[PDB]
UniProtKB/Swiss-Prot annotation:
Positions that bind Zn(2+): 142, 146, 166
Organism, scientific name: Bacillus thermoproteolyticus
GO cellular component terms, A-Z: extracellular region
Annotated protein name in UniProt: Thermolysin
MF terms in GO: metal ion binding; metalloendopeptidase activity
Entry binding sites for Ca(2+) 2: 138, 177, 185, 187, 190
First-to-last residue of the parent protein present: 233 to 548 of 548
Class of the enzyme per the UniProt entry, highest EC level: hydrolase
Length: 316
């Protein structure tokens, strides 16, 4: 909408106060004009029609319980935009400052979030498996990263290419969580998963097997559930990425860690210059090796560590 840029204040899902970029024209809208061609947050009003209505507020204060998922979807989309721009010189998900749109309060009791081809969508959860999913910065960045993937490598959402797609979203979701630097970890969704159970999470990158997911290619899922295991077999790639960054010895194979920033550079380059819609795990290894070679040189520690990490998870 046309209006003047304003700064509201409110409280997110976890009860924390933050400032939000809004737009004033009669109402204050969740429209952040400070980033690209805007970040826009919508109310889906417990229904499934999308996007719903651009979020309007009378007083620019967002402290109601109903407001909290909107505050966080809007704010964490901003952090994610900043990560991609500042760290990777990428302007929004399309590289040309496309407007970023999110809807909250999608459906009833909805234990998921997704990119629908055009926008991000967040359930409120049922209060048992999840609380409103935009409360997790890793979740928000996971969703926006699906848009980045779709505009770049275009990894088809099934089987190995789909597990790579998933892992890319978990990797960058985690790197954004570290960028913001509030309780960062290598777990996925811990801030919004199972409010009645402390210390768990939806997935673990450091130890995927803790939550049932494979940590070696010989343990990959080969059935048809979950689009051929895209949220399951992502553990193999998540583990490789964790090892590249942090190091470790896994099934007897030692990996020298190179840190998060270099992990992000290698995987961003692989995603944007080498992967294709049909890439499989072996092709991801090759893309990561080539990316590290371009950035650091063929004789570098970085290349050696990429190879060790893929060896450790059984991907040749
Ligand atoms: C980080 C998590 C908290 C959220 C993350 N959501 P996602 O991967 O973006 C789900 N997208 C999805 O299914 O897209 C299917 C599709 C395809 C095209 C258009 C529309 C939709 C996830 O890991 N979900 C898994 C469930 C909880 C179960 C486990
Ligand atoms: Ca208000
Ligand atoms: Ca965390
Ligand atoms: Ca996390
Ligand atoms: Ca929990
Ligand atoms: Zn996903």
């Amino acid at each position: 909408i046309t209006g003047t840029s304003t700064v509201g204040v409110g409280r997110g899902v976890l009860g924390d106060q933050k400032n939000i970029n809004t737009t004033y024209s009669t109402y204050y809208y969740l429209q952040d004009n400070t980033r690209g061609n805007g970040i826009f947050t919508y109310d889906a009003k417990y229904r499934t029609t999308l996007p719903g209505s651009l979020w309007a507020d009378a007083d620019n204060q967002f402290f109601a319980s109903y407001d909290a998922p909107a505050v966080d979807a809007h704010y964490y989309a901003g952090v994610t935009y900043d990560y991609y721009k500042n760290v990777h010189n990428r302007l929004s998900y399309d590289g040309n400052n496309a407007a970023i749109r999110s809807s909250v309060h999608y459906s009833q009791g909805y234990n998921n979030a997704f990119w629908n081809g055009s926008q991000m969508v967040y359930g409120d959860g049922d209060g048992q498996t999840f609380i409103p999913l935009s409360g997790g910065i890793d979740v928000v960045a996971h969703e926006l990263t699906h848009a980045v993937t779709d505009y770049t490598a275009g990894l088809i959402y099934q089987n190995e290419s789909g597990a790579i797609n998933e892992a890319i979203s978990d990797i960058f979701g985690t790197l954004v969580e570290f960028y913001a630097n509030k309780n960062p970890d290598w777990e996925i969704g811990e801030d919004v998963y199972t409010p009645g159970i402390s210390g768990d999470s939806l997935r673990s990158m450091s130890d995927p097997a803790k939550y049932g997911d494979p940590d070696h290619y010989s343990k990959r899922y080969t059935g048809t559930q979950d689009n051929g295991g895209v949220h399951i077999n992502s553990g193999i790639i998540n583990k490789a990425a964790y090892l590249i960054s942090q190091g470790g010895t896994h099934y007897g194979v030692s990996v020298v860690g190179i840190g998060r920033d270099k992990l992000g550079k290698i995987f961003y380059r692989a995603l944007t210059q080498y992967l294709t819609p049909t890439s499989n795990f072996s092709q991801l290894r090759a893309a990561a090796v080539q990316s590290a070679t371009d950035l650091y040189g063929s004789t570098s520690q970085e290349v050696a560590s990429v190879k060790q990490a893929f060896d450790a998870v059984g991907v040749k």
